Design a protein around this nucleic acid. Structure first.
Lengths: 57, 94, 71, 109, 98, 53
RNA sequence: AGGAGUGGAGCCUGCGGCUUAAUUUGACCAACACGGGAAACCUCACCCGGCCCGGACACGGACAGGAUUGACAGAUUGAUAGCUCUUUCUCGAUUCUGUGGGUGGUGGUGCAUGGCCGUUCUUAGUUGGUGGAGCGAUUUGUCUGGUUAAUUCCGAUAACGAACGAGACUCUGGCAUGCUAACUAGUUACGCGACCCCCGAGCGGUCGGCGUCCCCCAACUUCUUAGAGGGACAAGUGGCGUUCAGCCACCCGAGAUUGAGCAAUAACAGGUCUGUGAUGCCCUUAGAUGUCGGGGCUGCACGCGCGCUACACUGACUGGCUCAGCGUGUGCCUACCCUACGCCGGCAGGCGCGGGUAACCCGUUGAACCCCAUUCGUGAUGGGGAUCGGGGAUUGCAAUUAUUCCCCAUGAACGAGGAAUUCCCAGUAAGUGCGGGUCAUAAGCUUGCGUUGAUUAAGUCCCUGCCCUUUGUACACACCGCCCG
């Protein structure tokens, strides 16, 4: 579980995760009124807040 | 030896079985790469170009060189008669 | 890009001949089982399969790169 | 032409080369004799009979048929004197056909 | 074959346990790491899911060189009888999401 | 079946592949790209960059 | 007005033509060192051989003495492809076979399309509402005049009140001994002890000078770093203007322009189906347009474009001195980084050790032109380094049509360039080196950065072109128009 990548490369890999997800979801939640995401890593946990208008579907 | 094995056995073999004072038939190759060596001499080898197996006799004077230098892979070139647009003049018709 | 031009051979896959099956065990009296040629000796072979009686060549078909006696 | 413009609104092009009907029944090779105007033109057939050739749609201002040279001509089903142009060839194509021995070996380019 | 009979089970059983499969688009994968452990040397996941998908029983997304196969109710019934499993077992998931 | 299907790809322009679909021709490596210049543009808005100059 | 060139010469590279079994292909101001396109293989679409199915699913057929799977050797074969044949074991319902139906394609169509980009167009342009004027197409608003870089303002006024572009905005440069705070940044101060030379007063110590180690629980933040703030507004003065909007000069000083990013309405049969698992239709789909091996995109009597190196003395050559910046770097893709130090070699290079996730290690980036001293002497010369022979290294699975690098030898055109033509106004042109990009090996390319640093202008509509008004028109596919004998 280590070490860890360069600080320059740290942001690029985050951007790739932020972007890939945002097109993954758009191809499944299109009919459910998708509107975006907002990611947050939190202490020992990931949060992926899946914004859509109708949480029902 | 990265399976040049296939060539070097056929050469010695065919050289052996062939009548005295006569050369063998041919061993063919798509491999244009392999150093010409003293042991290879006296054999006759056809070498693939793009379609054609150009046959060559191996001399003791060719040692060190590659196989592919003795078989060409293009027509030397002829010309020509310059064509139409072959310059700042070709144009117009109607 | 353009369409294929005529060949003068092509043949795909051999039909892997339609031989009669199991005559490899010979019965002349019971409970005796008259085996012919030796059953395959490798650890990874089960030794319930027969070896080829292929004389001037002696080869396990379960093996596919190894164990080729020839005499 | 010598470049210019307005010559791209419309479908460049060209002859990606290509190949090769004949003759058929009443549909054969001729040579340009003259070069009238208005539109029509003259062309003696390769058999021996003369005829007067006529241009065909599309080929109108899409292909220039300078004087002298082989050209593919349909014959009218009933008319002798007037005949109908088809499908021209290339000068290279015409000398390949001549070398093959399918059209008569009489005319030079 | 098309593929062995061992390697069928190892895909169909693994799907039943997670409730979902994912894989990559390649044909030079050597043993398929990233589960099914070291016994799929070729397509096999993609090739078997596609045949399953033809007959319904699963849905399929694809995005940035990665498949995503979502098992469905009809396939659960099929796979349950096909693998001789209890009349009520789903080990993939079963709880209410809060 | 066959005893071959492949031949050494270990370096060169064929042993790396770009993430459009496994597209090429458009040689790319930069700062950990592996990302195609046509789509890089479409991800100007997406995160990694916002244009400022 | 001038500065430096191109066109001339040699070489690199792209394009046409020609050749070829194939020499794949798009593109003709707004193509042509462009498609990140510097192709050994791969790439790869092309050409020639060989193999494979990765033809789902459905229905029918075959079928457990069984559907079916694979392979040694020999022969064959570029081949160690059971590909084929000889030979005879092996696999076991996954299949095979027929029909229906799919699937793949750098296949075609950019004149079926989406998206993106370029261009008209770097100029100042653009539109609706309500009212007014016309039978209507339309027009007024959007202007005679002054003014501005700008449809920018002032003013006029059958229009009034608004919107988009311009500007405003964002980034960058230039001004802080003010503010904020720093052993992953420095300076100063000693404490110093150590080295060094008396080099200067003195004696060598000390005082002074030179850097390094020592530095702290020292002091500070000027230099370096990056944050919060302030500063420039035509502000003040003198002219000029309707004295309005503004313009010119000057003080202070950083002068109202340091350079970029963003950019309207409407349009083009512009480019791109070879970026796209974006996409219509058509084609092809087992003798495949979907995989391995070999060849080609580099082939030349010729034409053109972008550039590089040169024609010497304001130079070349050999020594000596001395200055920089933007960056980048292994732990990533699948096997790979940047290098100090020690040792060996003329060199390319080899070998042994160590550091670096990086204001921490490479690197106080100890770079070039320039600077200082020898040698050559107006000579196609020692200028120029093309062509070409032999030899040595490195990368790789492979280096031949020479991958790249090094050593010796060979020593061409070329002695300032026709008709024509490009680009440029201040740290700008020109000279000169460096980093990044592509990269297993390799920039004469492109993109950024420093260093040295001029001459000429402060204008004009002559040429080329663009904006606004007025006028004329047989034009509206719009003068690259139309039309006569």
């Amino acid at each position: 579980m280590a070490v860890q990548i360069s600080k320059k490369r740290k942001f690029v890999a985050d951007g790739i995760f932020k972007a890939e997800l945002n097109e993954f979801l758009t191809r499944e939640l299109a009919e459910d009124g998708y509107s975006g995401v907002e990611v947050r890593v939190t202490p020992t946990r990931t949060e992926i807040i899946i914004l859509a208008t109708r949480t029902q579907n | 030896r990265r399976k040049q094995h296939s060539l070097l056995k056929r050469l010695r073999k065919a050289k052996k079985e062939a009548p005295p004072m006569e050369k063998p038939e041919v061993v063919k190759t798509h491999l244009r790469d392999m150093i010409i060596l003293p042991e290879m001499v006296g054999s006759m080898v056809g070498v693939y170009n793009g379609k054609t197996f150009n046959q060559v006799e191996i001399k003791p004077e060719m040692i060190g060189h590659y196989l592919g230098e003795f078989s060409i892979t293009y027509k030397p070139v002829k010309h020509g008669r310059p064509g139409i647009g072959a310059t700042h003049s070709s144009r117009f018709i109607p | 890009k353009k369409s294929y031009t005529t060949p003068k051979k092509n043949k795909h896959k051999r039909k892997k001949v339609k031989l009669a099956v199991l005559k490899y065990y010979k019965v002349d009296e019971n409970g005796k089982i008259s085996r012919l040629r030796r059953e395959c000796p490798s650890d990874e072979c089960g030794a319930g399969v027969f070896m080829a009686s292929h004389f001037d060549r002696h080869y396990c078909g379960k093996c596919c790169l190894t164990y080729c006696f020839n005499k | 032409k010598g470049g210019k413009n307005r010559r791209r609104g419309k479908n460049e092009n060209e002859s990606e080369k290509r190949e090769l009907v004949f003759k058929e029944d009443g549909q054969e090779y001729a040579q340009v004799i003259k070069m009238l105007g208005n539109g029509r033109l003259e062309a003696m057939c390769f058999d021996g009979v003369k005829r007067l050739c006529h241009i065909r749609g599309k080929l109108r201002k899409k292909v220039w048929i300078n004087t002298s040279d082989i050209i593919l001509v349909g014959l009218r089903d009933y008319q002798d004197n007037k005949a109908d142009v088809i499908l021209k060839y290339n000068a290279d194509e015409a000398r390949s056909l001549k070398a093959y021995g399918e059209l008569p070996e009489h005319a030079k380019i | 074959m098309l593929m062995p009979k061992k390697n069928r089970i190892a895909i169909y059983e693994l799907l039943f346990k997670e409730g979902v499969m994912v894989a990559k688009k390649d044909v030079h994968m050597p043993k398929h790491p990233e589960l099914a452990d070291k016994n799929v040397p070729n397509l096999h996941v993609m090739k078997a899911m596609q045949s399953l998908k033809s007959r319904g029983y699963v849905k399929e997304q694809f995005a940035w060189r990665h498949f995503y196969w979502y098992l469905t109710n009809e396939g659960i019934q099929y796979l349950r009888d096909y693998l001789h499993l209890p009349p009520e077992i789903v080990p993939a998931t079963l709880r209410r999401s809060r | 079946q066959q005893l071959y299907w492949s031949h050494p790809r270990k370096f060169g322009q064929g042993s790396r592949s770009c993430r459009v679909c496994s597209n090429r021709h458009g040689l790319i490596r930069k700062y950990g790209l592996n990302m195609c210049r046509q789509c890089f543009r479409q991800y100007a808005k997406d995160i990694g960059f916002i244009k400022l100059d």
